[PDB]
Design a binder for this molecule. Structure first.
Ligand code: HEM
Ligand SMILES: CC(C)(C)OC(=O)N[C@@H](CS[C@H](Cc1ccccc1)C(=O)NCc1cccnc1)Cc1ccccc1
Length: 450
């Protein structure tokens, strides 16, 4: 301190920081709106402060490629630290430098296309659970809270694809549904991040210290009972890198569970909102599914990859609602990328949400228009502008699994039901002014049987 002269010095523009707070008062309308304003106010690069922490936004595709791919192992390797984490320091999304590179290696083969084709029959069976829990609400002409029913399915696939456990968590108190339920503080970190090590010597975990105590033992119950799913594929790996330890493995289990719980369910809710508020896209998708799977035939790994309009709908939804909002890398050395000095310790940020809604790359960016991703037009889309799964060595490892999971859900559900707005549906949907990509009011819709 005071780091607050850095961008003034480097000749990089940006909003003037308040003492201690930096620019965080500007987060009151949410990360997203702040980024969009800076992008129009300042242009291709700018700089702000989360407390004393300098953040350099970049929006040049080449420069973004340099950061995320070209200079990844050398400079922009780790994400911005947050804490206290405790033993979750060993989770892949959290770990750093060579220990991350190791965890990335030991867990990469789990996420292969071939391993994912063997999860399809299991992910298929809960697609049926999802339809019956839907019909019980459709036959009773009462509006439906999509996050609950998508959450219950997304919860079902996680427990199954990651440990073998098999519940219809919507309807009992099966010993597993509840510890995963615990699925203001985090803003006080930003002004006082010098207090993270304080909390790390106090063993306060941002992960409720009890959930983790439940699964550290629950895994070693499963580990010593067996002795097709993620835990097996990880136990099988630990049989050039030091093999995955037992606590290390639990920490990955925790990452996968959250990674694909609120994500899968949130995205599915954004897609169903768009398909209800655009009934022709919905009909057109329903037709393509009936063309590929006539007589409500069950989707397989290969018929899913055949559905091009389904892919367009998923991609365009993620353009509008990229649930990460930003990508970030901590610059670990004095570097120069594409003619611009970047001093060590700066956090480099890619404003994905702003870049997805930039009129300078998107005609009518607020409109939901799947055709942007027609095989005709899909080629003009800059892949360092549309980045819903990141890019380079540290992108979303669960990308293909998440696309596959969501699409199986949609096919099964669109085969059987159409989706209409209720009077209680929020149109236009508004994003949580807070810190997550979720709707302000939950998405509720009328569900009717075909
Ligand atoms: C629609 C669903 C999802 C979306 C849009 C999404 C998006 C992202 C993004 C943007 C990142 C940061 C990438 C970067 O920094 O370049 C990321 C990281 C990550 N994601 Fe996902 N994600 C989704 C679901 C999942 C799922 C289901 C898993 C399940 C295993 C998963 C596992 C991970 C991991 C482990 C990382 C950190 C990877 C690393 O640092 O090595 N994600 N995701
Ligand atoms: C800075 C602030 C306090 C505002 O929020 C964060 O601290 N958020 C990141 C920090 S790691 C996060 C750890 C985690 C585990 C369980 C519950 C919550 C969080 C993680 O592994 N999530 C996986 C994931 C989630 C979503 C998609 N794909 C994968 C989460 C993250 C974002 C983007 C890429 C990678 C991680």
């Amino acid at each position: 301190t005071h780091s607050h002269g850095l961008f003034k010095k480097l000749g990089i523009p940006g909003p003037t920081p308040l003492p201690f707070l930096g620019n965080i008062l500007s987060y009151h309308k949410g990360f997203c709106m702040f980024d969009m304003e800076c992008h129009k106010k300042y242009g291709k690069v700018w700089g702000f402060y989360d407390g004393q922490q300098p953040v350099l936004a970049i929006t040049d595709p080449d420069m973004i490629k340099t950061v995320l791919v070209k200079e990844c192992y050398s400079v922009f390797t780790n994400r911005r630290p947050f804490g206290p984490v405790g033993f979750m320091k060993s989770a892949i999304s959290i770990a750093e430098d060579e220990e991350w590179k190791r965890l990335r290696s030991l867990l990469s083969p789990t996420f292969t296309s071939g391993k994912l084709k063997e999860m399809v029959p299991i992910i298929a069976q809960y697609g049926d659970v999802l339809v019956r829990n839907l019909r019980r609400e459709a036959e009773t002409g009462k509006p439906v809270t999509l996050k609950d029913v998508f959450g219950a399915y997304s919860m079902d696939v996680i427990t199954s694809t990651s440990f073998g456990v098999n519940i219809d968590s919507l309807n009992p108190q099966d010993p597993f549904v509840e510890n995963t339920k615990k699925l203001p503080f985090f803003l006080s970190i930003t002004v006082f991040p010098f207090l993270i090590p304080i909390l790390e010597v106090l063993n306060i975990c941002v992960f409720p210290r009890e959930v983790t105590n439940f699964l550290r033992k629950s895994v070693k119950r499963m580990k010593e009972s067996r002795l097709v799913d993620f835990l097996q594929l990880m136990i099988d790996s630990q049989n050039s890198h030091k093999a995955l330890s037992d606590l290390e493995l639990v920490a990955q289990s925790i990452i996968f569970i959250f990674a694909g719980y609120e994500t899968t369910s949130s995205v599915l809710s954004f897609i169903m909102y768009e398909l209800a508020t655009h009934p022709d896209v919905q009909q057109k998708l329903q037709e393509e599914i009936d063309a590929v799977l006539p007589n409500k035939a069950p989707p397989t790994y290969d018929t899913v990859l055949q559905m091009e309009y389904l892919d367009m709908v998923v991609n365009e939804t993620l353009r509008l609602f990229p649930i990460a909002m930003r990508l970030e890398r901590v610059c670990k050395k004095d570097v120069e990328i594409n003619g611009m000095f970047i001093p060590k310790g700066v956090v480099v940020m890619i404003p994905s949400y702003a870049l997805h809604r930039d009129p300078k790359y998107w005609t009518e960016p607020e409109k939901f228009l799947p055709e942007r991703f027609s095989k005709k037009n899909k080629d003009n889309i800059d892949p360092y502008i549309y980045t819903p799964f990141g890019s380079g060595p540290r992108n979303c490892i669960g990308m293909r699994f998440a696309l596959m999971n969501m699409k199986l859900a949609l096919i099964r559900v669109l085969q059987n039901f159409s989706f209409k707005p209720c009077k209680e549906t929020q149109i236009p949907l508004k994003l949580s002014l807070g810190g997550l990509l979720q709707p302000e009011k939950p998405v509720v819709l009328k569900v009717e049987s075909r």
